[PDB]
Design a protein around this ligand. Structure first.
Ligand SMILES: NC(=O)C1=CN([C@@H]2O[C@H](COP(=O)(O)OP(=O)(O)OC[C@H]3O[C@@H](n4cnc5c(N)ncnc54)[C@H](OP(=O)(O)O)[C@@H]3O)[C@@H](O)[C@H]2O)C=CC1
Ligand SMILES: O=C(O)COc1cc(F)ccc1C(=S)NCc1ccc(Br)cc1F
Length: 313
């Protein structure tokens, strides 16, 4: 398979990227260096992950070393929920740029549709534990994202964790200037997302699949939860193809015309996860993997469920 997918801004995006949520700051610089050395050209970042400075050290070193040129990298970050007001978006983007050692981002996403009260805390809570909303709305946050394109800070803008009605809301915005290029959503065999994916794809929006391995390192994991990497049925497909279960889980979204962003800080796994362009899942394999859907989510958060714009039900 071809390495890149065409976006509706006319740029090409690598279909495989390195995830960085939970990558410890003392490990992520090496992880990104190794990733670039073994062929990765897309890194998925976010301010809320608290490691963009260290990601940036790696990017800058590999550019300085001339392992890669900047035009060949595709760096993605995301606007956190406490920065949805008009007067905060540009500074949030610029902080990310400064940390990542970048003059521009290839793609900047609204991380979640929900705006929260600005301040130091990423999840401001009331005394009963509910997130404190801001009275920002999706559409005005989108207008702020559009300004970043028009200032040269970002090449593409998109959304993340937007449901069907929220994507539609963005597409139907009065005076819409730039369509979202990407909707980044959780997607794997236990949360196959057929409905949302077809809607977005039909609208020319590329979907990126996050937590493709089921995020085994998620901090809220419980022992009872299903485990993709350990599922007998997925292991059998991997065995048949002489690949690892992770490699199957990465190739699966690729064949659905998705971008996929597995995270690792383990050098051997960073390389393993890139070796997914030399085998094909059959249509029967694809349908079989799709059949494992159970509407099971890594990423959800009880404290945010009453926000007017919380995306999931
Ligand atoms: N937009 C959003 O709201 C969200 C975005 N994301 C993005 O998506 C990325 C990926 O999702 P994430 O939730 O991190 O989880 P993943 O599904 O990518 O799973 C990461 C875990 O899998 C392990 N792992 C990686 N490769 C292998 C392998 N070959 N064999 C076995 N285990 C392996 C990692 O271990 P180790 O690192 O120890 O090797 C880590 O524990 C995030 O890092 C982030 O960039 C994720 C959630 C939400
Ligand atoms: O969010 C990520 O990329 C990965 O996860 C996170 C990454 C972080 F660095 C900090 C918190 C999260 C959480 S708890 N994310 C879930 C979450 C946050 C906000 C809302 Br609205 C709903 C929700 F489900």
């Amino acid at each position: 398979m071809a390495s890149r997918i065409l976006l509706n801004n006319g740029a090409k995006m690598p279909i495989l990227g390195l995830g960085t949520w939970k990558s410890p700051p003392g490990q992520v610089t090496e992880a990104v260096k190794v990733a670039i050395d073994v062929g990765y050209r897309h890194i998925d970042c976010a301010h809320v992950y608290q490691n963009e400075n260290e990601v940036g050290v790696a990017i800058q070193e590999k550019l300085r070393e001339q392992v890669v040129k900047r035009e060949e990298l595709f760096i993605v970050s995301k606007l956190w929920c406490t920065y949805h007001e008009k007067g905060l978006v540009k500074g949030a983007c610029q902080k990310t740029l400064s940390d990542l050692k970048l003059d521009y981002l290839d793609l900047y996403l609204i991380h979640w549709p929900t705006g929260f009260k600005p301040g130091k805390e990423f999840f401001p809570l009331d005394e009963s534990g509910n997130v404190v909303p801001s009275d920002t709305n999706i559409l005005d946050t989108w207008a702020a994202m559009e300004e970043l394109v028009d200032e040269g800070l970002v090449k593409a803008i998109g959304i993340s964790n937007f449901n069907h009605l929220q994507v539609e809301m963005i597409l139907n915005k009065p005076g819409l200037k730039y369509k979202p290029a990407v909707n980044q959503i959780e997607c794997h065999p236990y949360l196959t997302q057929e409905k949302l994916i077809q809607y977005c794809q039909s609208k020319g929006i590329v979907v990126t699949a996050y937590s493709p391995l089921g995020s085994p390192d998620r901090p809220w994991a419980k022992p009872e939860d299903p485990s993709l990497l350990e599922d007998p049925r997925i292991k059998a497909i991997a065995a048949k193809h002489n690949k690892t279960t992770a490699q199957v889980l990465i190739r699966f979204p690729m064949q659905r015309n998705l971008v996929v962003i597995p995270k690792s800080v383990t050098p051997e796994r960073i390389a393993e996860n890139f070796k997914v362009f030399d085998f094909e899942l059959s249509s029967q394999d694809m349908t079989t993997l799709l059949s494992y859907n159970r509407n099971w989510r890594v990423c959800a958060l009880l404290s945010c469920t009453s926000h007017k714009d919380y995306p999931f039900h």
